[PDB]
Design a protein around this nucleic acid. Structure first.
Ligand code: SF4
Ligand SMILES: [Mg+2]
Ligand SMILES: [Mg+2]
Ligand SMILES: [Mg+2]
Ligand SMILES: [Mg+2]
Ligand SMILES: [Mg+2]
Ligand SMILES: [Mg+2]
Ligand SMILES: [Mg+2]
Ligand SMILES: [Mg+2]
Ligand SMILES: [Mg+2]
Ligand SMILES: [Mg+2]
Ligand SMILES: [Mg+2]
Ligand SMILES: [Mg+2]
Ligand SMILES: [Mg+2]
Ligand SMILES: [Mg+2]
Ligand SMILES: [Mg+2]
Ligand SMILES: [Mg+2]
Ligand SMILES: [Mg+2]
Ligand SMILES: [Mg+2]
Ligand SMILES: [Mg+2]
Ligand SMILES: [Mg+2]
Ligand SMILES: [Mg+2]
Ligand SMILES: [Mg+2]
Ligand SMILES: [Mg+2]
Ligand SMILES: [Mg+2]
Ligand SMILES: [Mg+2]
Ligand SMILES: [Mg+2]
Ligand SMILES: [Mg+2]
Ligand SMILES: [Mg+2]
Ligand SMILES: [Mg+2]
Ligand SMILES: [Mg+2]
Ligand SMILES: [Mg+2]
Ligand SMILES: [Mg+2]
Ligand SMILES: [Mg+2]
Ligand SMILES: [Mg+2]
Ligand SMILES: [Mg+2]
Ligand SMILES: [Mg+2]
Ligand SMILES: [Mg+2]
Ligand SMILES: [Mg+2]
Ligand SMILES: [Mg+2]
Ligand SMILES: [Mg+2]
Ligand SMILES: [Mg+2]
Ligand SMILES: [Mg+2]
Ligand SMILES: [Mg+2]
Ligand SMILES: [Mg+2]
Ligand SMILES: [Mg+2]
Ligand SMILES: [Mg+2]
Ligand SMILES: [Mg+2]
Ligand SMILES: [Mg+2]
Ligand SMILES: [Mg+2]
Ligand SMILES: [Mg+2]
Ligand SMILES: [Mg+2]
Ligand SMILES: [Mg+2]
Ligand SMILES: [Mg+2]
Ligand SMILES: [Mg+2]
Ligand SMILES: [Mg+2]
Ligand SMILES: [Mg+2]
Ligand SMILES: [Mg+2]
Ligand SMILES: [Mg+2]
Ligand SMILES: [Mg+2]
Ligand SMILES: [Mg+2]
Ligand SMILES: [Mg+2]
Ligand SMILES: [Mg+2]
Ligand SMILES: [Mg+2]
Ligand SMILES: [Mg+2]
Ligand SMILES: [Mg+2]
Ligand SMILES: [Mg+2]
Ligand SMILES: [Mg+2]
Ligand SMILES: [Mg+2]
Ligand SMILES: [Mg+2]
Ligand SMILES: [Mg+2]
Ligand SMILES: [Mg+2]
Ligand SMILES: [Mg+2]
Ligand SMILES: [Mg+2]
Ligand SMILES: [Mg+2]
Ligand SMILES: [Mg+2]
Ligand SMILES: [Mg+2]
Ligand SMILES: [Mg+2]
Ligand SMILES: [Mg+2]
Ligand SMILES: [Mg+2]
Ligand SMILES: [Mg+2]
Ligand SMILES: [Mg+2]
Ligand SMILES: [Mg+2]
Ligand SMILES: [Mg+2]
Ligand SMILES: [Mg+2]
Ligand SMILES: [Mg+2]
Ligand SMILES: [Mg+2]
Ligand SMILES: [Mg+2]
Ligand SMILES: [Mg+2]
Ligand SMILES: [Mg+2]
Ligand SMILES: [Mg+2]
Lengths: 137, 99, 208, 82, 96, 122
RNA sequence: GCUAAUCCCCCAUGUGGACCCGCCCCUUGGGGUGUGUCCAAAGGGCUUUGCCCGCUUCCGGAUGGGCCCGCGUCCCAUCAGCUAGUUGGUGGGGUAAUGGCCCACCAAGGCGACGACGGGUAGCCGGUCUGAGAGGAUGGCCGGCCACAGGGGCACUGAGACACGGGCCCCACUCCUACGGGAGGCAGCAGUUAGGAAUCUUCCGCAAUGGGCGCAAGCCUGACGGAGCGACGCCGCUUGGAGGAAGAAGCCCUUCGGGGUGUAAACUCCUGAACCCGGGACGAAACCCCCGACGAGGGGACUGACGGUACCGGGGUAAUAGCGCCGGCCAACUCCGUGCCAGCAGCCGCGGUAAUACGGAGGGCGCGAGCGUUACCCGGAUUCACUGGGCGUAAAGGGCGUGUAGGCGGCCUGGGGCGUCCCAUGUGAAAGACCACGGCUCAACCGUGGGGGAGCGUGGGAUACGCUCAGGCUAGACGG
RNA sequence: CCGAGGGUAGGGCCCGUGACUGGGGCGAAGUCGUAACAAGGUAGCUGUACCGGAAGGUGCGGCUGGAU
């Protein structure tokens, strides 16, 4: 496994697309800090540290919209979109002045900075930059 | 200031001179990724005290010879032959890239 | 220079009276009153559906034909508007308006912009005192647009000054007849002019 | 020596010099060492002359030599008032 | 077809004479003195060495030697003479 | 390709192949005609196209089109040429400029006259 | 053969400065000090026991430079190996100065897939052009650096040159001549010729800015300031304006009733480019002279190539329009002629007797002292794709393993802080560009002010992710 | 001594050109046949090999991208 982070985000996207209530990803005090952004910003209900076969995991509680009318009754997603930016193949770093506005504000860019994991909004607030972990909307 | 660089000694087969290999990273100007590039400096060692495997710092200095414009500033670590291997194995591999 | 030919065919092609003459524009001897179909052998033939391209060309040509201005000059203004702050469609109409010869025709000193040119060109006009005979002078707020003293006493300008006495003049202008002088109050809000131009279609012409 | 003089900018029949400190061996309109004011011989605006006077005294203090018709525009701005 | 650049060449030729002339002597003497100091012959070496040192600094007054050349020439003279005398010694006059 | 692959090999800016080499970077080039004659065009056309083989100041010898109805070109006719092939006569890649050197304009053109070096009439 | 000097030399004089040795600070050859040694000079002019311009040695400044280092700088790997002054060392030579820059000896090294060596192409930058941007393309004019001065080599003079209009030599070419001999170097401004698709007057002036010499008067200045030619470009302006028929003639169409050109013309009136007449600049106030003190300061005078031009006044004539296109893309349609011919053509395609596609015509569309064509650059081209593409069948998975370099890499904890991120500060010239204002009647053009940036140096700071060191783990992997 | 260059001798790369020659592209108004496309009238294609005026054929092995 070469990208624990992408692996997580993908475990989610994959789950969210068949409408699972939850899905578990292998635990990391960094992966957590990202989920701590994902829930706070209201993309997930939240997470809890559980265990599977003795091994530390993060069970992640997924969130969607109403049932819908039409021949396809499947609800809208709350996480419509989530994708790595920086990767191990190509680390992506931004100064504060060049942090992107995801989707006109309606989405976020989580970022690892030396003031911890922030959103665009949060980063610009404390006025620091860093590795741009990913984007969600 | 006088530019200072840190690197491994890869040759001591000269008298009063060592070859110090300095490495650096930098984002690719277009493709973003952090990439390494390295370069050998001939460093003045009047004392023949620096040896193969030494990780050292060298300081840009007034020219000593053609090609020698750095003196060894000071030792940093001893015995990194594992680096010297990296370099040497690459040179040795060159015998296979010919015709 | 400017167009200088049969001017009625213009209106006829545009399908709209543009008031390019002055007096005759208002009579029933107006071309568009007699033959409101396009000039030449084919105007009576049934029009076929104009292309999108067609449409925007026409709108631009019309706005341009009104001011009798050369296409280069038109263009240079429009660009000027695209660098200038705000809404380009506005500013463009505004900047088209702040031209001397238009202001002069706006303030009524002549019956046609065509006539209002030859007036500026023949040095019969002034701004803030000084004589100006450049039809393209970009007039700013505050500017006093007079008749030449030596030109005040002239038949044509008399007859044309007399026709202005109680005619009201755009919210962005003031006219002091007898005193033969007028004032550029501000740049025109779009509403302040009501030209048969969807100037939006113009921006769209130049974005191809 | 280092000199203080007029570099002609502007355009044809429309002079606009920059009183300027440059090396004597430069070309007229060349790289100057420092700009220190301007001069409009046609006098066509409220301030057709200006001089950083605190500066022009430094360059002088340290050996710059003004041209003739620069000396004047430095007198007229009273860099010489004792 | 004419100039005062001609004049300027005329003079160069003449300065050249005085220069070459001056530099010859300086070398002649330093060598003479280094030669003595090898087989030293202490007093005599030092005698000539002064005569060089004079001649060096004298050329340095003008365009012949740049003063640092003179410095450089002088330094290398003294270094040579002395260290030669150390295989035998001892310094008979001045100096120093 | 991976990002790495691109660090290693880069992307390749691809050059253009000029379609009028004989010009040698010139907008036009002078020449003399060797052969002046007619050529049959390819499917589905049919004609007797007028053509000159021209020897150039640029060392090259090419076939150039002679546009217009009728001309005055023969061997030794000095001619200016311009770029532009004639699609239906393969190998013809250049045009003779009428109205220049020994190539007359078209007698009696009224329309499109500049492209044919025919003067404004009475 | 003669004679002068700010020419040359000798001695004197030593604040100082140079050099060897010692010693103190400093730490590459920086500053100080003691002994020894060595080094200065030119006087000219006034109003003449006093000032001006010089001359000398030292120190600092300022400005201009030399050298050195990090990083950046195109195409071909069908160029993969290159290197004997080669890489290092010791001593010397040389220079302002380090250095294999040069030399002697010694050692056997230096470089290379992070692309050496080789070939090809190109002066580099500020910028310019395009592009939403990223990027691409480009380096003409202006500014900066470099390099060169018929092709080569060389040094001399000098603060500075290995010197475009200085010197030496060799070559190639041309010329002159009295036939013995000798001379040249426009890639300075003009100009000739050749080449070419193609690129200017053998103009005027030092009035202005600048430079050189001079105490100054001033002299020189093809730098420069201007004038000439050329729609080459951009910007500005003209060939008029108002009125004027249910609407002439001519010409085109026509179902022969009419439709078009067209308010277009005529004609009527108004203005008044050009032209004529008068006046007529800004650019020029310093230098100098006067008083004062040859300073500060006040006042006097000279001087304008452009140019009697711009411009101001008065008078005053209706006064150049051309080019492309009209099958679709693409805005603009009918008649005749032609009949797979003549021809058009950027792509698709038009023409074989009713062609909106050829040629002419009427009419129409687009621009207008321009319009078109050819060439080339970016664009459209997300068609080299970083932004921002792809590989079952469209072009595209290596025949398969094994493995070197490389690229990449699980969970937890600490140290370091390289990447990364923040702040401060220096640098980021000027012009250009962007925003504001202002001057030429506008504009173009031009001036003043403002706004920043990447990037790189320096100081400080942060530690999440990447890194690195250190210590744990067992989910990857390996083993029993 | 070094030294522009000159001379001698032998190498390397590149460009132009050459009797003749090999195929290639095109043209098309021709001769010969009909190899592929249908089970294309012998399923096709294929690497190799031998062979034949020519498309091609046959052997060996492979693929189905083969009709029934
Ligand atoms: S409006 Fe005036 S211009 Fe337009 S047609 Fe009627 S008359 Fe002619
Ligand atoms: Mg990305
Ligand atoms: Mg050395
Ligand atoms: Mg109106
Ligand atoms: Mg529309
Ligand atoms: Mg705008
Ligand atoms: Mg209106
Ligand atoms: Mg556009
Ligand atoms: Mg002289
Ligand atoms: Mg001798
Ligand atoms: Mg010298
Ligand atoms: Mg000296
Ligand atoms: Mg055909
Ligand atoms: Mg020829
Ligand atoms: Mg045509
Ligand atoms: Mg005497
Ligand atoms: Mg003495
Ligand atoms: Mg040797
Ligand atoms: Mg040495
Ligand atoms: Mg020197
Ligand atoms: Mg060497
Ligand atoms: Mg490298
Ligand atoms: Mg390569
Ligand atoms: Mg070459
Ligand atoms: Mg070149
Ligand atoms: Mg684009
Ligand atoms: Mg270039
Ligand atoms: Mg160019
Ligand atoms: Mg330049
Ligand atoms: Mg040379
Ligand atoms: Mg030369
Ligand atoms: Mg030449
Ligand atoms: Mg020469
Ligand atoms: Mg010279
Ligand atoms: Mg020379
Ligand atoms: Mg040189
Ligand atoms: Mg020079
Ligand atoms: Mg010359
Ligand atoms: Mg004789
Ligand atoms: Mg001779
Ligand atoms: Mg001559
Ligand atoms: Mg010329
Ligand atoms: Mg010619
Ligand atoms: Mg010129
Ligand atoms: Mg002068
Ligand atoms: Mg002067
Ligand atoms: Mg002087
Ligand atoms: Mg002259
Ligand atoms: Mg009628
Ligand atoms: Mg009618
Ligand atoms: Mg009629
Ligand atoms: Mg009319
Ligand atoms: Mg004046
Ligand atoms: Mg067109
Ligand atoms: Mg178009
Ligand atoms: Mg159409
Ligand atoms: Mg015919
Ligand atoms: Mg017909
Ligand atoms: Mg067509
Ligand atoms: Mg036609
Ligand atoms: Mg124009
Ligand atoms: Mg293109
Ligand atoms: Mg487009
Ligand atoms: Mg692109
Ligand atoms: Mg991509
Ligand atoms: Mg594709
Ligand atoms: Mg496979
Ligand atoms: Mg293989
Ligand atoms: Mg590995
Ligand atoms: Mg790693
Ligand atoms: Mg890790
Ligand atoms: Mg760090
Ligand atoms: Mg900065
Ligand atoms: Mg700037
Ligand atoms: Mg900006
Ligand atoms: Mg203004
Ligand atoms: Mg500015
Ligand atoms: Mg840590
Ligand atoms: Mg570990
Ligand atoms: Mg396991
Ligand atoms: Mg030799
Ligand atoms: Mg040789
Ligand atoms: Mg020779
Ligand atoms: Mg052949
Ligand atoms: Mg078969
Ligand atoms: Mg068959
Ligand atoms: Mg078959
Ligand atoms: Mg077979
Ligand atoms: Mg046979
Ligand atoms: Mg057989
Ligand atoms: Mg098989």
């Amino acid at each position: 496994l070469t990208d624990p982070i992408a692996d997580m985000l993908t475990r989610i996207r994959n789950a969210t697309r068949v409408y699972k209530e939850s899905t578990d990803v292998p635990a990391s005090r960094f992966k957590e800090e990202i989920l701590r952004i994902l829930a706070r910003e209201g993309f997930i209900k939240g997470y809890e540290r559980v265990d599977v076969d003795g091994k530390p995991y993060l069970r992640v509680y997924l969130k969607y919209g109403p049932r819908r009318q039409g021949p396809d009754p499947r609800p809208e997603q709350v996480i419509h979109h989530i994708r790595r930016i920086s990767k191990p193949g190509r680390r992506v770093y931004v100064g504060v002045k060049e942090i992107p506005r995801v989707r006109r504000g309606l989405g976020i860019a989580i970022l690892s900075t030396s003031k911890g994991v922030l959103t665009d909004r949060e980063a610009r607030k404390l006025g620091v930059g860093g590795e741009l972990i990913c984007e969600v909307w | 200031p006088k530019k200072v660089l840190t690197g491994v000694v890869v040759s001591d087969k000269m008298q009063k001179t060592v070859t110090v290999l300095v490495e650096r990273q930098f984002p690719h100007p277009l493709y973003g990724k952090v990439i390494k590039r390295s370069k050998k400096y001939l460093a003045h060692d009047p004392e023949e005290k620096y040896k193969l495997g030494d990780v050292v710092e060298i300081i840009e200095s007034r020219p000593i010879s053609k090609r020698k414009r750095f003196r060894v500033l000071r030792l940093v670590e001893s015995g990194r032959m594992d680096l010297v291997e990296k370099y040497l194995i690459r040179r040795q591999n060159y015998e296979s890239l010919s015709k | 220079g400017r167009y200088i030919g049969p001017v009625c065919r213009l209106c006829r092609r545009e399908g709209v009276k543009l008031y390019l003459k002055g007096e005759r524009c208002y009579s029933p001897k107006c071309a568009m009153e007699r033959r409101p179909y396009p000039p030449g052998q084919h105007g009576q033939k049934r029009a076929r559906r104009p292309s999108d391209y067609a449409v925007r060309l026409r709108e631009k040509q019309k706005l341009r034909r009104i001011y009798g201005i050369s296409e280069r000059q038109f263009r240079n203004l429009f660009e000027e508007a695209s660098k200038k702050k705000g809404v380009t469609g506005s500013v463009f109409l505004g900047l088209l308006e702040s031209r001397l010869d238009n202001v002069v025709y706006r303030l009524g000193f002549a019956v046609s912009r065509r006539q209002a040119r030859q007036l500026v060109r023949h040095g019969h006009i002034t701004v803030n005192g000084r004589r100006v005979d450049l039809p393209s002078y970009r007039v700013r707020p505050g500017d006093e647009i007079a008749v030449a003293e030596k030109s005040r006493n002239l038949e044509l300008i008399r007859q044309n000054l007399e026709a202005m006495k109680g005619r009201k003049v755009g919210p962005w202008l003031s006219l002091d007849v007898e005193g033969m002088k007028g004032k550029f109050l501000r740049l025109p809000d779009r509403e302040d002019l009501a030209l048969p131009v969807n100037e939006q279609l113009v921006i769209e012409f130049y974005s191809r | 020596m280092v000199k203080i003089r007029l570099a002609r900018f502007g355009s044809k029949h429309n002079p606009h010099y920059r009183i300027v400190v440059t090396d004597a061996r430069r070309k007229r309109d060349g790289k100057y060492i420092e700009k220190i004011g301007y001069y409009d011989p046609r006098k066509t605006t409220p301030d057709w002359l200006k001089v950083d006077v605190e500066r022009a005294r430094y360059w002088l203090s340290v050996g710059a030599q003004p041209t003739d018709t620069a000396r004047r525009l430095l007198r007229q701005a009273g860099v010489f008032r004792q | 077809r004419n100039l005062s650049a001609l004049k300027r060449h005329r003079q160069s030729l003449k300065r050249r004479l005085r220069n070459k002339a001056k530099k010859s002597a300086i070398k002649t003497l330093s060598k003479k003195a280094i030669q003595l100091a090898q087989e030293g012959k202490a007093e005599e070496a030092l005698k000539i060495m002064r005569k060089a040192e004079s001649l060096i600094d004298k050329a340095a007054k003008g365009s012949t030697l740049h003063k640092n050349a003179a410095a450089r020439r002088k330094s290398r003279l003294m270094r040579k003479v002395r260290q030669l005398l150390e295989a035998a010694g001892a310094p008979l006059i001045g100096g120093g | 390709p991976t990002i790495n692959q691109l660090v290693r090999k880069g992307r390749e800016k691809v050059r253009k192949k000029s379609k009028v080499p004989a010009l040698k970077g010139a907008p036009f080039r002078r020449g003399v005609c060797t052969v002046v004659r007619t050529v049959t065009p390819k499917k589905p056309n049919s004609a007797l196209r007028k053509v000159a083989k021209v020897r150039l100041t640029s060392g090259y010898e090419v076939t150039a089109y002679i546009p217009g109805e009728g001309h005055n070109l023969q061997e030794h006719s000095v001619v200016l040429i311009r770029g532009g092939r004639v699609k239906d006569l393969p190998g013809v890649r250049y045009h003779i400029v009428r109205g220049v050197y020994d190539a007359a304009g078209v007698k009696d053109r009224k329309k499109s006259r500049s492209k044919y070096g025919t003067k404004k009439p009475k």
